[PDB]
Amino acid sequence: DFTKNLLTRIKNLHPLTNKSTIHSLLSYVFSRQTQNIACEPMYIDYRKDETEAIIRWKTPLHAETCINAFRTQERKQNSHDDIRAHRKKGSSRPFLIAELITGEEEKNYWRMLKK
């Protein structure tokens, strides 16, 4: 038993970032996507020196807003502590991507959390 559609994978984070910066970046981007709901990334699963994180959002609406935000906004983290993540001309950094985790990978997230 779990609430479906809460989880978003964020890809192409700066490898030397941290959970606090990810939280601020997500909130900054979320606020440009909507002012109707607040940014509530309840848990951020992130390991230092990785370029991906899994976000457990408070509700499915939050997760959907996150997906829409990164699809419509070009963002690239320029340093480990960059929150606003403006793409720079000529930068070799890739664009931040957010994907909803579904299917067996979603089931396994909750199974491993409860292990």
Swiss-Prot record:
Transmembrane segments: none annotated. Residues 1-115 form the xRRM domain. Residues 1-113 are annotated as: xRRM-like region. Changing residue 56 to A: Abolishes binding to ter1 RNA without affecting localization to telomeres. It is found in: Chromosome, Telomere; Nucleus; Cytoplasm. It comes from the Eukaryota. Disruption phenotype: Critically short telomeres caused by reduced ter1 RNA stability and telomerase holoenzyme complex assembly defects. RNA-binding protein required for assembly of the holoenzyme telomerase ribonucleoprotein (RNP) complex. Specifically binds telomerase RNA ter1 and promotes assembly of ter1 with catalytic subunit trt1. Telomerase is a ribonucleoprotein enzyme essential that copies new telomeric repeats onto chromosome ends and functions to maintain cell division. Belongs to the LARP7 family. Component of the telomerase holoenzyme complex composed minimally of trt1 and the telomerase RNA template component. Interacts with skp1. This is La-related protein 7 homolog. The gene is pof8.
